[PDB]
Design a protein around this ligand. Structure first.
Ligand SMILES: CCCCCCCCCC(=O)O
Ligand SMILES: CCCCCCCCCC(=O)O
Lengths: 49, 99, 281, 238, 39, 238, 238, 281, 39
């Protein structure tokens, strides 16, 4: 159990991290689903003016 | 890099990057679980390994999760972190996860 | 520390451990170093001769792809009057932009491919001219101005019926590498543009249809692709999460609702003990 | 240096940053049955990692008036994981045990637990001539509780219990106890369902006390069978 | 084989298998030993 | 052994008894510009001790709702001491930096600060297409504050910020962070008044908390330029 | 000489006095996974005798109008003995199989059974575009029955099924068939509950017939896993 | 047992045989072995030096042919709106399917050839884009969506006037070989698809006409051919006899009347003593 | 000659004349002698 004295906060935080080890390998490149656009970005068209 | 484990309604910004644990009144309590989804959105998606891996389709290799306790020096405790290979439903009791 | 890596590392079998003073699974994140705990120290492992290759993740391959950097449609008819000018930049299309922005500095030569398509408002096999106008040089004002004589500027003439035009632009920065990000101002006064390194200024790509107009009008679309090669990259960075807003800065707003909202990058789940795609048997 | 320790067996590992060295019962270490001591002639199964790993039992709460707890081996594990399955499908078993008892509190708490591994701890009943029954002895994973820890529930004494392999968890000093147990019996192997080689006893000789905020202070037991061997295969006595 | 006179015109160079992850994973002045307490 | 540390440069020195080793950005160390990488042909001035020393900036207060702080280099020091004078009188400068962030509390406090050195940290503005202005970027010795630390005020994420040279100050573990930064740029030297090579960011990922007596808990930054070189002497742009 | 045979594995043995040599699928023999073909990095458990032994399934009756029977592996054994327990507690498994089909009658009976081991026998459904469902495929220890043996219930043909490892039980000649199967898959190990490497099919190409006293003529199947290995230990998916 | 075979085996002359205890023509089918009776033991033979080659039956040649795997027609006009998406599979065309299904496992690289044809509802020389969208990647929703910028996905741009486009897809299974047949389910739950190994999932082929629509409509047909090479094959199987019913399974029904009916694969003859094409002199 | 950098891009390999029919025709543990009674 988490056990603390009266003057220590009774709710504590954990920060979790993750990483690959050196036995890792990736294949078959594809476009990432994490970014996209439905319109011209501001200033894109102005590059032609 | 940091996993967004507290991806819940009510948690805003950086609050989503830390998991709060409290002094328990009962024993063997479940504190949290982490979906190991990389393709589907989840705590592992916005990490260095998650972001880069998503530019690919196939993967192989071991992963490592490190947790840093950020309570005060006077706080003590023991936790058990479990990885359950696939096949069944996510364990909800320590007696099962511990296997 | 540096070494040649062609395959993923092998695993060595490990035995039971019960040693005082030895705790490989404990670490100190505060040092800034990533955990050095090996699988062999966390659990009992078997021996595995790993033959998995790592070449598809070489930076040269990761960035070595022709990506769309410019797309422009204009009307070809009797009058953009049969030509256009594009101030070169690699920030208009998000797929390429996000990948380049995974690095702080980049040094590379750039293969440029130009694809042209036409539609009637049969199809004429037009001749086009793409002229590279470097910084400080004069840009054309008309489809027929003297500028197109291109006495020194490099120009490429190609037909719509030929394969896409292609040429390589060398690494041309005045520095040893391009600054993908620039925490500074482009001028000596205080009103200059922020985040734009003058050193990475390429110039303008001027494209015109060489043929005089026909009796009818056509819509011509020019697409430019860029593929970096002979790449060197430095200092990787956090990937972009918020949608891009402008080609001139890193301004952000976030999606209206998760995922990728300013308030929450990852979509919500009911609670920290809720497993989203739980297997139900 | 002797305060930190990591134990790793199979797919399980445990670390402690407040240990007190660790005990190897009678200075021995577990080992497989050699040919010159063997009796059963059938080729044994040695499952290794599927059984030789840490199994954590349900925790118990250390209260101001607690008398102590006990778990018998192999009974406590006879229905847990693959160790439990091998035990149920085989007439004979043999193994050592790595015991790790855990209990943390604050620098403002005091208390001392005797953590002792007792071989052949034959219990006695109090104030009656009737011998203890099956259900008084076989508690399984839940373990039992001491009625009169002062005499170890067997008419002897806890004062002299230190003659058995043990460690202490003195809150002010450490937060865990570790004991390695070798096979302990007069026979090379045994029927796991009717005889317990060892009994793990955890007794608060000095009660838990403090003047700081009260919190539930648990005691947790993790046990890893070692060098497991099974003979006499048949159907399960599940 | 590059038939152009300028070397920058050549095809891609996908043969640099050198790596040094430690500049990102262990940029600490004092090397951290395997199982020895980091602190 | 890796918890105590003394840094000495010029007439300045700093000691910490609760360090966590220290970070050498990308495994490098500062150095003077070699002849084979030089561009500017005038003989440079290398003031050594007058500029390569610790400069301590004004402290900031760590509050329960703080979002984080940042200081850009060399801007933060462009008007401090002899480093500042050389910067104002010379068109070009070059140097590394030794950063030491300080923050202590009690064994009853909790909190965790990410201390990261970001190369070319180009800021973005929130909910507008207008680029950040001069005064939004050049804060000088006072430094700035994060509006949305969650995305590092640049549309990316603090979660992945660990890809940059960094350390953490976890109150329960240490009270200081130290990072050595080498010259980081695509040119051998640069004009110090319009470009910042590095940005020091200090962000509370885990908020400051306690149930003991409340006290002002400051965070202090000390920075020592290293191997300073200046070229292109003229009048001061003071 | 090639008519008598004894198979012995673990605590089990079988003899036949009317065999027809025996088949080694594709001329191979079972073996443990070598380090140069391994993928899963955890140390595997190799239970040996507790799993590598003969398991006899319930018999079936050979009737005048029988169409044939089939059993999928490992499904048929996934809930039998220690092999079944290891399968339920582990995400991954690997093994070969020694198959022995038994059927005796009299010198006055006639009949011929094709005993074939089919790799990846993906069943098809009859006269519908809907794919077979979970319960049409996973029959367990009971096995299934052929609807249209003529096309092997997959739109091909039993006539050409001899291209697969097989033997025949021609009553006039022999009373048993034996086939040794090596690990057959495109991966070094697999999840045992959702994929069957082999399908044992027993089909009466020549119906059972006689003019002597009618008696129930059973067909019995005994299967012994070989060189079993399991990885990815966790709780049971019982 | 293994050996190099380049020609059919020769025949050796044989003499009269009358040996007790030797009966080469007798065998025992029950063992599962095929008869080992040699021609020389069955009859008196002469010597024949056989020079007949066996290379045309090499697996590499047997399967090494470009076969149609996809055919799709769509309307190119002002609005499948000028593009389509095809979930890749090799089960739609029966000639290729039956041959691949003669094996249990197959490992090979695949040469892909794309042939395009057009018809007016003269012919325009259009530019098309075929983008390979791997599993998990986003597929285009419109002829002009951002997805086509193809920053990482491999895309090939080709004209109708050029020879068919061509490229090779490597053996890309996550296993050592593709599973032509799969006796299992694709998921951890019980409702998954049967007979479909997830491991053999390639992805989607997205094809669009790059040109904006013309004033009139056209019908465009795209045909994709696949040719396996660098082939390795394992465990041959009984050939398909019943007509195929679905691309998702081996379901069968049989023709309405022989041949290849569920009740009779071979067509009937009057009796077992009736010779069908008997020579009448 | 393959001018591409990836070997899988090469033309077909029609030179593997190795065979072992016996894995399909005689998968019996005990070799069957020419004219000797198989049983
Ligand atoms: C199309 C011509 C491209 C020339 C090279 C441009 C490099 C830009 C690097 C960047 O700042 O992201
Ligand atoms: C057109 C792309 C083909 C990629 C390779 C597909 C292999 C399928 C093998 C099969 O299951 O029959």
């Amino acid at each position: 159990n988490l056990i603390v004295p009266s003057e220590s906060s009774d709710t504590c935080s954990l920060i979790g991290f993750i990483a690959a080890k050196d036995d890792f390998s990736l294949r078959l490149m594809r476009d990432s689903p994490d970014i996209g656009q439905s319109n011209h970005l501001h200033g894109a068209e102005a590059a032609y003016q | 890099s940091m996993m967004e484990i507290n991806n819940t309604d009510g948690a805003n910004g950086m609050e989503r990057l830390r998991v709060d644990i409290s002094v328990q009144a009962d024993l063997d309590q479940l504190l949290f679980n982490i979906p190991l989804d990389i393709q589907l959105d989840g705590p592992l998606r916005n990490t260095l390994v998650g972001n880069i891996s998503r530019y690919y389709t196939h993967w192989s290799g071991s992963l490592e999760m490190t947790f840093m306790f950020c309570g005060s020096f006077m706080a003590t405790g023991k936790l058990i972190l479990c990885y359950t290979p696939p096949g069944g439903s996510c364990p909800t009791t320590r007696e099962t996860a511990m296997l | 520390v540096e070494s040649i890596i062609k395959t993923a590392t092998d695993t060595v079998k490990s035995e039971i451990n019960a040693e005082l003073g030895v705790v490989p699974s404990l670490n100190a994140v505060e040092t800034g170093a990533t955990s050095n705990t090996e699988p062999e120290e966390a659990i009992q492992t078997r021996t595995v001769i790993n033959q998995h290759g790592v070449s598809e993740t070489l930076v040269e391959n990761f960035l070595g792809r022709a990506a769309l950097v410019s797309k422009k449609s204009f009307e070809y008819k009797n009058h953009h009057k049969n030509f256009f000018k594009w101030t070169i930049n690699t920030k208009s299309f998000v797929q390429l932009r996000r990948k380049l922005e995974l690095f702080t500095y980049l040094r590379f030569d750039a293969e440029i491919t130009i694809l042209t398509t036409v539609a009637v408002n049969g199809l004429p096999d037009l001749t086009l001219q793409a002229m590279f106008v470097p910084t400080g040089a004069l840009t054309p004002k008309e489809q027929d101005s003297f500028h197109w004589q291109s006495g020194s500027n490099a120009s490429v003439f190609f037909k719509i019926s030929d394969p896409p035009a292609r040429m390589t632009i060398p690494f041309m920065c005045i520095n040893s590498a391009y600054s993908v990000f620039y925490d500074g101002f482009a001028g000596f006064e205080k009103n200059g543009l922020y985040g734009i390194n003058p050193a990475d200024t390429i110039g303008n790509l001027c494209v015109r249809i060489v043929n005089e107009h026909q009796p009818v009008g056509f819509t011509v679309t020019v697409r430019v692709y860029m593929k970096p090669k002979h790449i060197k990259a430095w200092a990787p960075r956090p990937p972009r999460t918020m949608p891009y807003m402008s080609i001139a800065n890193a301004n952000y707003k976030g999606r209206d609702t998760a995922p990728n909202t300013l308030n929450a990058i990852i979509g919500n789940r009911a609670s920290v003990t809720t497993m989203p795609h739980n297997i139900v048997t | 240096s002797d305060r930190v320790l990591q134990l790793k067996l199979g797919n399980s590992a445990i670390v402690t940053q407040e240990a007190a060295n660790y005990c190897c019962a009678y200075g021995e270490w577990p080992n497989y049955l050699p040919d010159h001591e063997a009796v059963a002639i059938d080729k044994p199964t040695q499952p290794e990692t599927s059984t030789d790993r840490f199994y954590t039992l349900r925790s118990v709460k250390w209260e101001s008036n607690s008398t102590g707890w006990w778990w018998k081996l192999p009974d406590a594990l006879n229905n847990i994981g693959m160790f439990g399955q091998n035990v149920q499908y085989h007439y004979l078993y043999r193994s050592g045990f790595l015991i790790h008892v855990q209990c943390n509190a604050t620098k403002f708490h005091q208390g001392a637990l005797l953590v002792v591994a007792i071989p052949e701890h034959q219990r006695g009943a109090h104030d009656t001539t009737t011998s203890p029954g099956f259900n008084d002895i076989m508690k399984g994973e839940r373990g039992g509780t001491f009625n009169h820890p002062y005499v170890l529930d067997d008419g002897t004494s806890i004062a002299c219990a230190t003659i058995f392999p043990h460690q202490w968890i003195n809150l002010r000093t450490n937060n865990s106890a570790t004991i390695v147990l070798p096979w302990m019996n007069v026979a090379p192997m045994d029927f796991p369902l009717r005889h317990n080689q060892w009994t793990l006893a955890v007794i608060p000789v000095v009660p838990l006390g403090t003047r700081t905020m009260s919190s539930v202070v648990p005691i947790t037991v993790s046990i890893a069978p070692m060098c497991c061997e099974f003979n006499g295969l048949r159907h399960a006595i599940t | 084989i590059n038939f152009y006179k300028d070397s920058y015109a050549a095809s891609a160079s996908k043969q640099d298998f050198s790596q040094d992850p430690s500049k990102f994973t262990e940029p600490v002045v004092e090397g951290l030993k395997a199982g020895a307490p980091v602190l």
